[PDB]
Amino acid sequence: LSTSLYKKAGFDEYTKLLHDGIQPVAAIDSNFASFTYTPRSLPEDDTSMAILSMLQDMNFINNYKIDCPTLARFCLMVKKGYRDPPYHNWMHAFSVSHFCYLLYKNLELTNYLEDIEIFALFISCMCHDLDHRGTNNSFQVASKSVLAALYSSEGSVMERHHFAQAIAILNTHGCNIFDHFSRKDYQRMLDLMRDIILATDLAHHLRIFKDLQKMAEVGYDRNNKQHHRLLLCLLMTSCDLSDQTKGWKTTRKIAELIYKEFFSQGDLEKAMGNRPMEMMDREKAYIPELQISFMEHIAMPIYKLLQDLFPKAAELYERVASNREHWTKVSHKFTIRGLPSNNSLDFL
Amino acid sequence: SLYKKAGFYTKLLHDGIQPVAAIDSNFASFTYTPRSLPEDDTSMAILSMLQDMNFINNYKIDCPTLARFCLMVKKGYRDPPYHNWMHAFSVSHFCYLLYKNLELTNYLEDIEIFALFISCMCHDLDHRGTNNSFQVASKSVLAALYSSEGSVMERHHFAQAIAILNTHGCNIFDHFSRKDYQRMLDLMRDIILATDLAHHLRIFKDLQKMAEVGYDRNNKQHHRLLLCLLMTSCDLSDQTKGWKTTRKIAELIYKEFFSQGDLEKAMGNRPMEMMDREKAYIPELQISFMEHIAMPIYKLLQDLFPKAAELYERVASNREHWTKVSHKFTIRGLPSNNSLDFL
Ligand SMILES: Cc1nc2c(c(CO)nn2[C@@H](C)c2ccc(C(F)(F)F)cc2)c(=O)[nH]1
Ligand SMILES: Cc1nc2c(c(CO)nn2[C@@H](C)c2ccc(C(F)(F)F)cc2)c(=O)[nH]1
Ligand SMILES: [Mg+2]
Ligand SMILES: [Mg+2]
Ligand SMILES: [Zn+2]
Ligand SMILES: [Zn+2]
């Protein structure tokens, strides 16, 4: 049960960060702007600089006149804002943010969304799981947590907390990256971040799914305000699940992290005298079938919509479909429930 | 179903801040009927109440900015039978009565009371005389913006309030620090969202629990729950007045609801009973509303504030009057002239 203890490094580095200026994206890696780049390969100590590099490459620092020391402090505060569970940690937020940058470079998002909307999407990616406890929304209610007391009445418990943590950072002395905005634009920016972070709740995704399908059917209209809103939600879910667009070795490792996290929650629920849901129970869970279901009912339809809207996103859908096929192959040589005793999927 | 917006100060600066007894000797009493005040005197009365609660001085509110803000809020309401400016003014007046009679300063932070009052003024801004289900059924721009999030109209009312604050010369909170400005807007969001009946249904179990264990002023959840309870008591305060007030407000509420029902029939949709002039039995619906919604709110208010007992007793008395009337009433909907005087 001690595996459910995930620490915060501080409370709710910098001069060294900007010492040699912002590194151009190609100097980080020649493959940095490619769908074949695996952001989790980047040393954790280099991620803060990579956030600044992406924002500079997307021209947001220049367009929004972002004070670089304020941006450096904000980046570091966001990074410090994640705990250390197996999956919902800063490297997850970093990977999600990188994928938003990949969509910008490869899908030519500037021809579909307003500059401010893309910038809000990127910042939302960085913040979208802030202070995650390695437990889901249902656990918050069951454990009668401070978070459930605060947000169960307004829905999407963790997501509302992630947004509140983002605002708390913007309100910390020397971290307000949106200080060059007028009161009107600052308000628009926080309303965009609120909606985008809320879009990471799977229940929200399922609620707008028919609207996303209709938008992909009729075709995206850049002069349609609802199309902009729907597209921002779809893109946020695509960034959140972007590990599924990588190579087999990435998807397998991410399944190991996800199930180690889920199973620790299930074990904690058992120690509390409760019955966890099947996928969180190491004695009931069959990982290959659970991953196949997740790929077929959640991940693949998101990337199929992405391909329907953006033909250049075809390679992403193809990679997710190929990883679903890999789980089918694993299902014919994986004879255990849960994870092996060593918590590793290396035996494959 | 067509309810217009009137648009897209010097008089209020000359004598807008009047002592409250000059408005009415009974102005600070639970027996006052704010709907009796001429509409043309309501902006002055809002200023008088903010001065009487000492919010203007305490928060260094700029008076011309406050006068502009009040006028903008008043102009931000349409003219449906019920959800108009007179409704927001009467709701604001009740918040003032709670401040004057229940010693709120002993349960909530000054800023929470101030946010509650401003939220009252703004809580139904730009209301269309239709509920949240109608927004979704009509595929309106409001449903497009907020239906996936929930509480369609309440999210719009809050958006309208912020749009007024962001209008030149109307930002009554401009001088506030970033943290305080954020705190105020977050309080307004939470309080306006608490006016959705769907939200009240979801928090009733917690409200009941708070009243049972007893209010704890050091408990942050208690402050949030108390604000929701106070806001709903302000929103339903017409039920705490005399029989003539509750009869007249039922006339306004149902003229509004029946118009939505007519619109739904024209869309080829089956409206719910309450909105259907051909199915609705007003006394039955009013008794159900009093028993399930209004009376439990005022009973929880009496449990937390014994000085609020007179409010619960008045609501219970009005419910009894609807039950007696539910024999002297035989018709569905409203008569041709839309009057309930036949009781
Ligand atoms: C069963 C399962 N759940 C997963 C996986 C991953 C990694 O790609 N994330 N999640 C969860 C946390 C998740 C689901 C759904 C959204 C959405 F709402 F954005 F779509 C976000 C997050 C996975 O591999 N298996
Ligand atoms: C059926 C019915 N509904 C009424 C009445 C009144 C007037 O007192 N207002 N409402 C609705 C609009 C309403 C309900 C409930 C909240 C709450 F969530 F804040 F409690 C707000 C508003 C009434 O007399 N009958
Ligand atoms: Mg999340
Ligand atoms: Mg309302
Ligand atoms: Zn995430
Ligand atoms: Zn109201």
Swiss-Prot record, chain A:
**Can you say what this protein is called?**
cGMP-dependent 3',5'-cyclic phosphodiesterase
The similarity annotation says: Belongs to the cyclic nucleotide phosphodiesterase family. PDE2 subfamily.
Effect of altering residue 244 to P?
Loss of 3',5'-cyclic-AMP phosphodiesterase activity. Loss of 3',5'-cyclic-GMP phosphodiesterase activity
| Annotated organism of origin | Homo sapiens (Human)
Q: How does it assemble?
A: Homodimer.
Noted disease: Intellectual developmental disorder with paroxysmal dyskinesia or seizures: An autosomal recessive disorder characterized by global developmental delay, impaired intellectual development, language delay, and early-onset paroxysmal hyperkinetic movement disorder that manifests as sudden falls or backward propulsion, eye or head deviation, and dystonic limb posturing followed by chorea and dyskinetic movements. Some patients may also develop epileptic seizures or only have seizures without a movement disorder.
Report the outcome of residue 259 to A. Answer: Decreased 3',5'-cyclic-AMP phosphodiesterase activity. Loss of 3',5'-cyclic-GMP phosphodiesterase activity
Record's comment describing the protein's domains: The GAF 1 domain functions as a dimerization domain.
Counting on the full-length protein, the chain here runs from 581 to 916 of 941
Regarding tissue, the record states: Widely expressed. Expressed in brain, with high expression observed in the corpus striatum. Also expressed in heart, placenta, lung, skeletal muscle, kidney and pancreas.
Q: Which residues bind Mg(2+)?
A: 129
Q: What is the effect of changing residue 339 to A?
A: Decreased 3',5'-cyclic-AMP phosphodiesterase activity. Loss of 3',5'-cyclic-GMP phosphodiesterase activity
Q: What is the effect of changing residue 290 to M?
A: Decreased 3',5'-cyclic-AMP phosphodiesterase activity. Decreased 3',5'-cyclic-GMP phosphodiesterase activity
Q: Give the top-rank taxon of the lineage listed in the UniProt record for this protein.
A: Eukaryota
Domain PDEase, residue spans: 13-334
The residues forming a coiled coil are none
From Swiss-Prot, chain B:
The outcome of changing residue 334 to A is: Decreased 3',5'-cyclic-AMP phosphodiesterase activity. Loss of 3',5'-cyclic-GMP phosphodiesterase activity
Q: Tell me what the record says results from residue 254 to F.
A: Loss of 3',5'-cyclic-AMP phosphodiesterase activity. Decreased 3',5'-cyclic-GMP phosphodiesterase activity
Q: Which domain of life is it from?
A: Eukaryota
| Result after altering residue 254 to A | Decreased 3',5'-cyclic-AMP phosphodiesterase activity. Loss of 3',5'-cyclic-GMP phosphodiesterase activity
Effect of altering residue 253 to V?
Decreased 3',5'-cyclic-AMP phosphodiesterase activity. Increased 3',5'-cyclic-GMP phosphodiesterase activity
**Entry annotation: catalytic residues:** 83
Query: Any S-S bridges, and between which cysteines?
Result: none
Provide the free-text tissue specificity comment from this protein's UniProt record: Widely expressed. Expressed in brain, with high expression observed in the corpus striatum. Also expressed in heart, placenta, lung, skeletal muscle, kidney and pancreas.
PDEase domain residues? 9-329
Q: Which family does it belong to?
A: Belongs to the cyclic nucleotide phosphodiesterase family. PDE2 subfamily.
* Assembly with partners or alone: Homodimer.
Cite the domain annotation text.
Answer: The GAF 1 domain functions as a dimerization domain.
What does this chain do?
cGMP-activated cyclic nucleotide phosphodiesterase with a dual-specificity for the second messengers cAMP and cGMP, which are key regulators of many important physiological processes. Has a higher efficiency with cGMP compared to cAMP. Plays a role in cell growth and migration.
**Clinical note on disease:** Intellectual developmental disorder with paroxysmal dyskinesia or seizures: An autosomal recessive disorder characterized by global developmental delay, impaired intellectual development, language delay, and early-onset paroxysmal hyperkinetic movement disorder that manifests as sudden falls or backward propulsion, eye or head deviation, and dystonic limb posturing followed by chorea and dyskinetic movements. Some patients may also develop epileptic seizures or only have seizures without a movement disorder.
Kindly provide the name given to this protein in its UniProt entry.
cGMP-dependent 3',5'-cyclic phosphodiesterase
Q: What gene, per UniProt, encodes this protein?
A: PDE2A
